[PDB]
Amino acid sequence: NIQGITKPAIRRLARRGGVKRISGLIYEETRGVLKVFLENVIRDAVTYTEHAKRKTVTAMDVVYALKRQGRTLYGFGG
Amino acid sequence: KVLRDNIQGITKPAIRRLARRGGVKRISGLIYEETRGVLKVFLENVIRDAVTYTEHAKRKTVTAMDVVYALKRQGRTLYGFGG
Amino acid sequence: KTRKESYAIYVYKVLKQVHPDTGISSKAMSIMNSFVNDVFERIAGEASRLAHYNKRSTITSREIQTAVRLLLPGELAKHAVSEGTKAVTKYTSAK
Amino acid sequence: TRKESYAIYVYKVLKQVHPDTGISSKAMSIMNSFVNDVFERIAGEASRLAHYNKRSTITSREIQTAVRLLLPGELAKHAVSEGTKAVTKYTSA
Amino acid sequence: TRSSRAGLQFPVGRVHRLLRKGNYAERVGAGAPVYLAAVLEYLTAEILELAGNAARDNKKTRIIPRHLQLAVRNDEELNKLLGRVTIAQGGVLPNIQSVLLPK
Amino acid sequence: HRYRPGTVALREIRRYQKSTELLIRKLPFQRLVREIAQDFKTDLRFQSSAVMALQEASEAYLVALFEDTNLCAIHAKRVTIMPKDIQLARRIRGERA
Amino acid sequence: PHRYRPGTVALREIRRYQKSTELLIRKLPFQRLVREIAQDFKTDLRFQSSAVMALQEASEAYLVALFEDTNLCAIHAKRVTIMPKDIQLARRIRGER
Amino acid sequence: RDILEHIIYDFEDPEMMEMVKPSLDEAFVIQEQNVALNFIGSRGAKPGVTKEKRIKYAK
DNA sequence: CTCAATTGGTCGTAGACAGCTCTAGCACCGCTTAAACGCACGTACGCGCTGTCC
DNA sequence: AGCGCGTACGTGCGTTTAAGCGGTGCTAGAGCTGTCTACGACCAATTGAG
DSSP states (O other): OGGGSOHHHHHHHHHHTTOOEEOTHHHHHHHHHHHHHHHHHHHHHHHHHHHTTOSEEOHHHHHHHHHHHTOEEESSOO | OOOOSGGGGSOHHHHHHHHHHTTOSSBOTTHHHHHHHHHHHHHHHHHHHHHHHHHHHTOSEEOHHHHHHHHHHTTOOOOSSOO | OOOOOOSHHHHHHHHHHHOSSSEEOHHHHHHHHHHHHHHHHHHHHHHHHHHHHTTOSEEOHHHHHHHHHHHSOHHHHHHHHHHHHHHHHHHHTOO | OOOOOTHHHHHHHHHHHOTTOOOOHHHHHHHHHHHHHHHHHHHHHHHHHHHHTTOOSOOHHHHHHHHHHHSOHHHHHHHHHHHHHHHHHHHHO | OHHHHHTOSSOHHHHHHHHHHTTSOSEEOTHHHHHHHHHHHHHHHHHHHHHHHHHHHTTOSEEOHHHHHHHHHHSHHHHHHTTTEEETTOOOOOOOOTTTSOO | OOOOTTHHHHHHHHHHHHOOSOOSOHHHHHHHHHHHHHTTOSSOEEOHHHHHHHHHHHHHHHHHHHHHHHHHHHHTTOSEEOHHHHHHHHHHHTSOO | OOOOOTTHHHHHHHHHHHHOOSOOSOHHHHHHHHHHHHHHHOSSOEEOHHHHHHHHHHHHHHHHHHHHHHHHHTTGGGOOSBOHHHHHHHHHHHTOO | OOSSTTTOSOTTOHHHHHHHHHHHTTTTTOOSHHHHHHHHHHTSSSOOSSHHHHHHHHO
């Protein structure tokens, strides 16, 4: 799964990030950091979901998790 | 009494001591000026907030509480003074 | 069925007041609704804390004022203060 | 003038933890600040949780999930064990 | 209507409702929701203006999240207000650093 | 002919800062999400919108991280960003301890 | 005579101040500065000495943290210590202005 | 023009002028004598590490 | 199409708000000397590169 | 990135400053308390905006 974040996808992102030249070691680092990130975000989201007694993680759960993380996202309801 | 140039009360050795607690071994002579700059901007922000709280309180005294609230609003929560 | 409320219509009205030309995509409309809710949150939260700091029960227009002056950048706060004072004076000119 | 402080409670705690150890005035102060801080953070999070669930009666469950959100996982686990133990005792009382 | 009474588009009534229900305080003085609605309409006007101007710059009949992101990040004050905010489909500003470009 | 190595890179940066659509393939991200969440709770469901929101936040976070890292590299006077750059970046952000 | 080699005393100093916790800025200068800046916002404001000391504690801890980040920026090519470019970098990574 | 005055004794001949031009286009990146000596010193059979020794060798 | 916004009215109390003081924050002198300044000095680490590696 | 270059800023020292103490005066407005009612909450009856 994790390797589903393909080398080209990470290149594309870093290019959006303005990275001109990339050490190949950046790919596994990016995967690790993204994993950690998701971990935290999803844990918070599920913790809202668990509190709501839901099985479905909703977009609001993700928004509220990000709002906690200091990552406030507009686009899915406030 | 008009107050001016008190930025210079941040003496080079003071900034040095701070850089020491900060773990800086060797300090560019340029840092001292930029450091005064950064400190000024920071104080500006915290003071602006504390003043705004005093204005809402209609108080003419800036209290420790107002500074604490300013710092918490700044996201830099300070313990030791209340709040 | 679920009659989920939003500021949509007011965002469109204000857009047509600034730009009668063009419209707004539903995605951008959702982003505007989000932004509205966020700013409302931040301001009401600030005013709440200002009240508690003064032990006051009532969030007045003045609490909102000082909250806006703390929260927004100085120029943006300035203009927002102008707008709020104008609006409150207009409201109090009607009944 | 009737300034509430956690001084006595924190004392009691410390007498559990290191009765031979005193807390300085300023250290106590800081602990008071910390206690108030974490109180406000947890309660505010519980409030937002309550809003999200349209629940106007913050229960122990809202505090529990708030604590799981705020505290890092091991500290959270311990805090949960303590909270549920205390609620259990209070329920039995 | 009250927004009428104040010249506002934003719903003074619903802002008052949300301030009451949001437990922001025991009581919310009737001047507070008027003022807040006015601020929430000066904001939003600010950004929708900038986004419509960007749409003209980008030659578009509709504001799309690109235009909002552009407006927010180009205006230094909105970027101060929204520096900890991310926007769906917004992308990022053109950013290439001087040592990356060729001489 | 041959484009001198690094000349398409800037072109691609220009494209991908022009573009705004999401850059990770949707299903592989979604599956990574479902995997990570399974570790926390079994038999979970995701709204498609919730997955897209996660992907938005993740990508925009990563873009900002890459930006910062790039700046670290430039401070290294390096064109090539490296793991040590990401480490320094996050460290200054205080993400990693 | 006797002379410590360069940075020997500096290391001894760092050890010293990381052992201690007092205020490193001289108080009264700081207080005057605060008064000056506040005067720009509003004339005739009285400052509780405690409120001053609080601003000082905050300023010192903030600048010390900043110096920490700056010295972390030193790291590449076994480069040593701190220059204003480093400060600017660290601040921008924080997202400070 | 101080060069070519040594190589084309009358500029009135276009043919040698237009013939020598491409050697100038090989060198126009260099004007001062000092970078020229750095160039030659760097082609030395025993090039000195420091630039100055390379100049002195080429000198 | 409909229930959230709306109004005139009462209630009763939040907080206006005015007085009252005395906290502690304002100035102020003035002596001590830690710390600031400034100057010398030098050596080490900030500048440089082309060696060289992919 | 090894190694050269070199002058920046560290260690020192001698002089100058004014930070600090602290001792003393003053005062104003922080905060307290007491009086009133403007006000926002609740309400029933009303309307049409979303």
